[PDB]
Design a protein around this ligand. Structure first.
Ligand SMILES: [Mg+2]
Lengths: 27, 116, 229, 40, 174, 51, 326, 152, 180, 247, 319
């Protein structure tokens, strides 16, 4: 739906993009 | 000072395909084959006489466009795009262009008028 | 080249292949190929020894390296193939039709058919030592009939977008295990009396100038001069 | 298509075509010349 | 390094200039025995038959060199004497049998017997009888013809090359 | 027109080169001489009709 | 003594400098290092961005200060808008290009200036050891895109022979007028002829409307057949007919303006000698000057030269008040 | 004025050397930290992607094989009336007279197409081919017919 | 041979006529128009699943940029390119053995490939057509005519067969002393 | 007095050697009274130094002239009166521009293969030339990829399919069929002299400039004699070059 | 077919009749009228001894020319002779016009004369075209003239093969009265461009430019280019560098231009309310008038470079 197909690889905990998102939403 | 682009170690920052930067040479057909103009003979002394001799079909009123040309050279230098520009319908300008190309090949417009 | 509003990925492998650990022979082939390969290749090594002029050096390494490396996947002793031109058939109308072959653009013509156009046989159909080579021709705008270049011949097949930066074929081992024997090639038993296709192609290759001076065993000698005799 | 020039034999007939296919000997001669140039 | 586009500078100076880069190191020596004999025979064509003193008179009568002109001995502008038959005004009679042997060698796709070339060699001697009787069975004319024989296999030894050339040395001396 | 053209073609040094498009036919058999891999003789995903 | 490419810089990204920089970026294939100067770095970044996206054949480099532009470039080319901007960039600034010129540099000025400015520029460039060429350009930015510009180069002849391969990338008719200052005088005479032929075509189409000639293109063909043809008439006659037949219609803005032509004719009048402490009379040129002044005094000096026509008699009003004073 | 609005909203600056992926992957010796993304893409695409099979090689056996070595021996049986029809048709095509529409080499051709189409040439076909090539003076082609009969 | 003739496509000698090599088009715009060099009948078969005899290839009438110019720069390499594929062996089979017809545009396209001479309609408009008279033709024919046997052997090599064995090959084809 | 000639255009392909020598000859014989504009198509060149030295042997200094194309005069094409096209012969023309020219077709009169003059006619001289090789003009176009109609993947404003978008500054050539609108239009067939052949001495390359100079002296004398009968004035004012030409 | 009658034989009248006798290969009948019957007899003999392919008639009155010819073409000397022949005579061509006749006037006349001629020809039922010719007498002999035809459109389309016999550039201005205005506008532009080129070369000599041969090559590629600038510049160089040198006599003179420019101020509306609604036109007119009375009227149009300041003389003192 609103989520893309690369969502589970983008937001996987421990990955580079998920750590960047956690650093962005909490500096 | 600074080079364009954040990389500054590349000649092209967006890095296109190197076939995009390859040049394109060109050669006109006039360098290959010339275009000659035959003078008006005694059978067709004018350009309106040439349009009258090409007036054969009912749906190709060739002799109705005598005022659409300046002289013999203006008739024999106009291609089909310039005939479209001057306001000539498709069948009439096709007949005019084929008559001019037949006269350049050695065939004068000597055909029977099939109207009646 | 990267576009603006989208994200890209990276290929882990270039091809979907079978692993070399699945068989002992593929493993031995990989170890023998890594023996015959470099670890790092630079501008002074033997695959880059064909750059004998500094103009070719600046042409290869400058502004066309992305095209020059995309020609052939394996590193060979050159970058393409030499271009040779063909003869024009005689036009019996004479100079009335000598203008018609010269045009504005280059006209490239490629072959198709039952024998020609297979992606699995691409390096064999572009082999210049193949007598059934896929025929290409290019008419220049001045009327010259020439053959196609290597990239021009590879443009008519499917894309091959990988490159080998290690293997160099003069570094192959040839003395201990890789010993091709003539008796192995004699096991096919190629004979001229049992099959005459090779002699027929040799007859098709040689000129037929002798057929007109047949009546002019009888063997052809030099012309005898009567003025000096 | 067979060309009908204006100087062919006219068929003065109101029940059919106004021009026949009967040529002039000059038309015969130039048609022979064009025939040879196609024969090559 | 690159110059500005000016005075309509050509990309390549010859058709086969960049095609020589697409050969291996032995194939440049294979074609060097063929094309190098074609360049030298064409360069010494206008001074063929001249003595050692007449060649020095050509280099002495023209002493104007702007350092981009080459030697006036090579590709001379002198007037030839018999001045020629048809094709032989650019190459000698020895080169006419050389190019005919190369044409058979290119179409035979490898080694070939002497009988493939015997009919083309006697046609030029029948057409040029004056050049035939001057050069037949001489050491200079025979060696120039069979010079292009190790292009077929340059890694051959002397036993293989002299055996293959022996059929060609017979007919050139017969 | 044939004799003048054949004389100037024999005297021409440029057009004496062979032309593979003009000189011969490369292959005239209805089947190719070597296997290109095809056919497959098996079905795949989404194919119900086999054979 | 390092074998390298030529460092060529273009100073000023304006109406005409941007197509000059684009022609130098496209048509120079790895033969020069291109430098782009502007007062704002974002404009040079935009020019280099468009050149890199459209696909250029050389590497480019942005500048913000004239000192780096002086120390980097072997050839400097200035295409600016005003004589004040060129005099600031060449002479008046502390980091100016001619005052800090290195030995062997070549500075070409394409901006139309006065005679004394180019004289002092060439004199101080020869004093510094560099070379100065003044080459005022004639043409539209669309004509600069097609590579057809008129250049009148004054300066050294050997420098002109060196700069011809760069001049041929954006200009077609490149002439060498002679010593320094001759191309400026040629530009002054050409713009005087522009103003005179513009006023003549203005009154010609006014006579065509007053005498009842509807179509203008057939009149253009007749004048091209006769001796009364000119370039400004063929350029202006559709706009002149649309402005005269619609007398309330406002003219459009063009690349050339009334104020730019008036500033160039003011440079010509400052460079023209006086005889006996008074101005040499020139009637048609002064009449065109009156029409241009009446067009510029109405606030429509940003628009095209066809805007002259609605103030033609108004220029004579400027004469008549100057008649009315004792 | 039409060029100042159209900025670069389409391209982006290229990848630097030794760069990473947008997903965080990189080309290192240890690929345990890197992952594949082929299972996140849709399973079937209408058409062909620019990265679809861009580097795909085939076996060495395809380019080292000789000619006509892949053809297996197939026993194409047929009706005996079809045998009679094809034998009479080949015998009529071999025995064609050499006029201006038929060269004598066709007498050697229609025998060869008899063997390419997996028919066994009977003795009457060899007799007709040798007699037709002997009547036209082609003795070497008749010996070629005899060698064809011997090689069968 | 119909009561009401199809007015827009008339042909000769009924259907299906002689096989002809044509260049057929698609029902698309000109910007994506390509041509198919095909072998078909004189009247197009619209009642079949086999609408053509053989497909000789595809011609693209739009010029492409030379994408191979830095490979090896030859003369006139950076000009545009007209891409065409031609089945050579099928064309020679349908031309010589089957004796197809040819339209003028495939004739010009194959004359660009070196397979055929330039067509009859490709006119050099600066050179007029020749004028023949039999006396000058007879004088040129009697000035230099070939021998009878030489002309017969030339026709035999060109039309009948070109691989005729020499005596040195006949001496090799014969058997040896265990059978001789 | 002011002549009735509205101008003279000398068209060429390069405007390097032959048209610069023709402008120097015609300006001396008319004593500068007629406006003479020498132009070309490819202007990215300088005047050849052998063209300056050969014209200096008469006393004409064409070094002050400049290489300039005809693009400023194509808009004013109907304003000029005389149009001269100096162009090579189509039987001798080569497109590579680096080789000596070919041999023309030879015909029989009353070893190169000669043709029959009735079977191969010789392009009769009462015909006029409509479009020559010098009747082209440059057309610069650029298809920019930052245009959203060109950046779209289904677009025909590119010369390829899958490599990139647009095309950076390609040049094409149009045709100018306007030389017949001029009052006097001639075509001068002369070989190219501005390009040196494979190996050739400097005196041999200079000798071709002297042969091209005497052909330009003959054709300029025949042109101004024709123009004197067209306008009705005297245009051969300086006959100091003609007394060395007739004698 | 239609009969053709040419009226008036002068310096420009006779080659039109000669080209009508040449090109009409016995298809259109030719009749010849002039101011005297002896001149018509002389030009008919001159057409007869050099080769006449069609029959030609000689007439002394306009009545037989009206009753015999459907197309009448007049090429007269001055405006008064045309006003006498077309309207003021008792046997006038327009006052006794036949319905369907086509009367073409090649004389450079005023706008009110052409308006009265077209109005009275439309009242009589005929069609009047005014087409003033521009060109040289030898250009008329060679068949190159410029014609600006005003009148009816279908009458212009009927007259195109007749106009193409002695003129190559024949343009249709539109309604009658607009063909005679085009020559006035063209010669006004000729005078203005001549004055502009003279003052530009005067300023070029003032600025100290020694090379004028490269200056005109620059100016022809600029936006201030004109054909008069190409025409007068080698003469103006000698007239400026040598001011004591008298200008040479040419074919086109100052009085020949002023005779046409004296039609324009009579053809223009009231100017006295603003006293100058045409600055550069009268600025060129005053220079031409100062060159006329000084003795240089019969000489070339480049003689105005010595009277540039004198055109200021009627501007400072009259204001
Ligand atoms: Mg020039």
């Amino acid at each position: 739906g609103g989520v893309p197909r690369i969502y589970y690889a983008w937001m996987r905990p421990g990955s580079f993009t998920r750590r960047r998102f956690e650093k962005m939403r909490n500096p | 000072d600074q080079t364009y682009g954040p990389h500054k170690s590349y000649k092209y920052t967006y890095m296109p395909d190197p076939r995009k930067l390859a040049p394109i040479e060109t050669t006109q057909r006039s360098e290959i084959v010339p275009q000659s103009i035959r003078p008006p003979t005694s059978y067709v002394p004018n350009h309106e006489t040439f349009l009258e001799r090409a007036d054969i079909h009912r749906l190709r009123p060739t002799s109705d466009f005598k005022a659409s040309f300046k002289d013999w050279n203006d008739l024999f230098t106009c291609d089909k795009r310039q005939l479209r520009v001057r306001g000539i319908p498709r069948m009439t300008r096709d007949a005019i262009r084929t008559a001019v190309q037949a006269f350049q090949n050695g065939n004068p417009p000597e055909r029977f008028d099939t109207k009646e | 080249a990267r576009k603006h509003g989208l994200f890209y990925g990276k290929m882990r492998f270039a091809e979907q292949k079978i692993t070399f650990y699945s068989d002992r022979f593929l493993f031995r082939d990989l170890v023998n190929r890594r023996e015959a390969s470099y670890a790092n290749v630079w501008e002074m090594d033997d695959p880059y020894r064909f750059l004998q002029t500094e103009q070719d050096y600046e042409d290869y390494w400058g502004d066309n390296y992305d095209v020059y490396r995309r020609m052939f996947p394996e590193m060979i002793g050159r970058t393409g193939e030499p271009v040779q031109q063909y003869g024009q058939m005689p036009i019996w109308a004479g100079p009335h039709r000598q203008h018609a072959n010269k045009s504005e653009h280059n006209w490239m013509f490629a072959e198709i058919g039952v024998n020609v156009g297979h992606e699995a046989l691409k390096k064999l159909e572009l082999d210049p030592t193949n007598e059934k080579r896929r025929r290409f021709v290019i008419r220049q705008p001045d009327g010259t009939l020439r053959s196609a270049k290597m990239s021009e011949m590879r443009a008519w097949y499917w894309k091959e977008e990988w490159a080998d930066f290690r293997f160099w074929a003069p570094q192959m081992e040839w003395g201990i295990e890789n010993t091709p024997s003539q008796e192995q090639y004699q096991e096919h038993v190629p004979d001229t009396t049992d099959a005459d296709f090779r002699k027929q192609r040799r007859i098709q290759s040689r000129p037929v100038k002798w057929f007109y001076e047949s009546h002019y065993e009888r063997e052809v000698r030099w012309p005898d001069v009567i003025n000096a005799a | 298509r067979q060309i009908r020039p204006y100087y062919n034999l006219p068929s003065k007939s109101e029940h059919g075509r106004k021009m026949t296919g009967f040529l002039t000997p000059y038309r015969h001669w130039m048609w022979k010349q064009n025939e040879l140039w196609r024969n090559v | 390094v690159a110059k500005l586009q000016h005075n309509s500078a050509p990309t390549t100076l010859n058709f086969y200039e960049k095609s020589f880069q697409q050969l291996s190191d032995v194939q440049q020596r294979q074609t060097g025995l063929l094309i190098g004999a074609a360049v030298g025979d064409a360069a010494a064509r206008a001074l063929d038959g001249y003595t050692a003193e007449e060649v020095a008179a050509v280099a002495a009568e023209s002493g104007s060199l702007q350092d981009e002109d080459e030697d006036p001995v090579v590709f001379a502008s002198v007037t030839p004497r018999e001045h020629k038959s048809g094709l032989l005004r650019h190459h000698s009679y020895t080169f006419y049998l050389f190019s005919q042997l190369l044409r058979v060698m290119a179409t035979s796709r490898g080694d070939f017997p002497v009988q493939y070339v015997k009919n083309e060699w006697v046609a030029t001697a029948r057409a040029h009888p004056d050049c035939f009787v001057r050069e037949h069975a001489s050491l200079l004319h025979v060696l120039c013809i069979t010079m292009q024989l190790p292009v077929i296999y340059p890694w051959a030894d002397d036993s293989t090359l002299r055996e293959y050339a022996s059929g060609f040395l017979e007919f050139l001396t017969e | 027109f044939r004799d003048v053209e054949e004389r100037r073609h024999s005297r021409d040094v440029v057009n004496e080169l062979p032309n593979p498009w003009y000189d011969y036919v490369a292959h005239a058999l209805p089947f190719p001489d070597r296997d290109a891999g095809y056919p497959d003789e098996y079905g795949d995903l989404g194919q119900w009709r086999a054979p | 003594a390092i074998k390298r490419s030529l460092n060529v810089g273009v100073v000023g990204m304006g109406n005409m400098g941007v197509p000059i920089a684009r022609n130098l970026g496209f048509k120079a294939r790895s033969a020069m290092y291109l430098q782009i100067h502007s007062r704002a770095l974002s404009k040079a970044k935009r020019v280099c961005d468009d050149l890199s996206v459209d696909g250029a054949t050389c590497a480019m480099r942005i500048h913000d200060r004239y000192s780096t532009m002086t120390k980097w470039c072997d050839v400097i080319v200035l295409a600016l808008a005003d004589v004040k901007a060129s005099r600031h960039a060449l002479l008046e600034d502390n980091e100016s290009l001619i005052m800090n010129a290195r030995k062997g540099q070549i500075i070409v000025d394409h901006t139309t200036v006065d005679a004394e400015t180019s004289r002092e520029c060439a004199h101080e460039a020869a004093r510094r050891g560099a070379y100065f060429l003044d080459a005022p350009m004639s043409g539209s930015p669309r004509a600069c895109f097609n590579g057809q510009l008129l250049l009148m180069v004054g300066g050294d002849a050997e420098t002109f022979q060196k700069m011809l391969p760069i001049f041929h990338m954006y200009a077609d008719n490149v002439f060498h007028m002679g010593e320094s200052g001759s191309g400026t005088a040629a530009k002054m005479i050409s713009q005087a002829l522009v103003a005179s032929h513009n006023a003549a075509a203005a009154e010609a189409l006014s006579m065509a409307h007053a005498l009842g000639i509807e179509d203008q293109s057939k009149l253009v063909q007749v004048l091209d057949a006769s001796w009364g043809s000119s370039t400004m008439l063929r350029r202006n006659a559709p706009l002149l007919q649309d402005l005269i037949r619609n007398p309330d219609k406002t003219p459009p803005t063009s690349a050339v303006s009334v104020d730019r032509l008036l500033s160039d004719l003011a440079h010509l009048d400052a460079s023209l000698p006086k005889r006996g402490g008074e101005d040499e009379p020139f009637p048609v040129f002064d009449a065109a000057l009156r029409s241009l002044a009446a067009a510029s005094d109405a606030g429509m000096g940003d628009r095209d030269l066809a805007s002259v026509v609605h103030y033609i008699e108004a220029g004579e009003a400027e004469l008549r008040n100057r008649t009315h004073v004792p | 004025k039409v060029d100042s609005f159209h900025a670069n909203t389409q391209y982006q600056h290229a990848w630097p050397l030794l760069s990473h992926d947008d997903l965080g992957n990189s080309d290192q010796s240890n690929n345990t930290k890197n992952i594949m993304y082929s299972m996140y893409m849709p399973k079937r695409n209408k058409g062909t992607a620019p990265w679809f099979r861009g580097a795909d090689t085939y076996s060495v056996k395809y380019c080292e094989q000789g000619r006509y070595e892949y053809q297996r021996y197939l026993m194409i049986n047929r009706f005996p009336s079809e045998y009679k029809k094809h034998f009479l048709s080949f015998l009529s095509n071999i025995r064609m007279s050499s006029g201006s529409a038929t060269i004598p080499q066709e007498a050697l051709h229609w025998l060869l197409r008899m063997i390419v189409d997996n028919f066994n040439p009977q003795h009457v076909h060899y007799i007709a081919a040798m007699k037709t090539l002997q009547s036209a003076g082609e003795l070497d082609m008749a010996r070629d017919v005899w060698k064809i009969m011997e090689r069968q | 041979a119909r009561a009401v003739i199809k007015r827009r496509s008339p042909q000769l000698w009924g259907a299906p006529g002689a096989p002809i090599i044509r260049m057929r088009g698609h029902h698309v715009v000109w910007k994506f128009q390509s041509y198919d060099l095909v072998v078909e009948h004189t009247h197009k078969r619209r009642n079949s699943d086999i609408r053509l005899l053989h497909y000789l290839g595809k011609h693209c009438p739009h010029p492409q940029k030379s994408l191979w110019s830095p490979d090896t720069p030859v003369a006139q390499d950076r000009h545009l390119f007209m891409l065409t594929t031609v089945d050579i062996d099928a064309f020679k089979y349908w031309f010589g053995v089957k004796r197809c017809r040819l339209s003028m545009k495939p004739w010009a396209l194959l004359a660009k490939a070196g397979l055929l001479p330039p067509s009859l309609t490709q006119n050099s408009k600066i050179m007029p057509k020749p004028l023949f008279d039999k006396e000058s033709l007879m004088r040129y024919y009697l000035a230099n005519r070939k021998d009878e046997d030489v002309m017969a052997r030339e026709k035999y090599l060109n039309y009948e067969n070109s691989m005729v064995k020499t005596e040195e090959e006949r001496a090799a084809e014969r058997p040896v002393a265990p059978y001789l | 007095m002011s002549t009735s000639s509205r101008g003279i255009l000398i068209a060429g392909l390069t405007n390097r050697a032959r048209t610069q020598m023709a402008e120097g000859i015609l300006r001396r014989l008319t004593a500068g009274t007629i406006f003479i504009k020498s132009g070309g198509v490819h202007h990215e060149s300088t005047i050849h130094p052998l063209a300056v030295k050969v014209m200096k042997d008469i006393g004409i200094d064409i070094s002050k002239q400049s290489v300039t194309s005809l693009e400023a005069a194509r808009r004013q094409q109907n304003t000029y009166d005389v149009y001269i096209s100096i162009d090579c012969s189509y039987e001798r023309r080569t497109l590579d521009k680096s080789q000596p020219p070919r041999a023309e077709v030879r015909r029989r009169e009353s070893d190169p293969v000669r043709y029959d003059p009735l079977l191969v006619p010789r392009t009769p001289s009462h015909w006029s030339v409509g479009v020559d090789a010098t009747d082209v003009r440059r057309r610069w176009q650029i298809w920019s990829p930052r245009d959203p109609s060109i950046f779209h993947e289904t677009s025909t404003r590119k010369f390829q399919d899958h490599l990139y978008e647009g095309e950076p500054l390609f040049m094409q050539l149009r045709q100018c069929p306007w030389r017949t609108q001029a009052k006097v239009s001639e075509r001068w067939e002369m070989d190219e002299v501005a390009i040196r052949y494979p190996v050739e001495r400097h005196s041999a390359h200079e000798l071709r400039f002297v042969q091209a100079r005497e052909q330009l002296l003959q054709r300029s004398f025949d042109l101004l004699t024709k123009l004197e009968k067209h306008y009705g004035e005297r245009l051969l004012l300086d006959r100091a070059l003609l007394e060395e030409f007739i004698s």
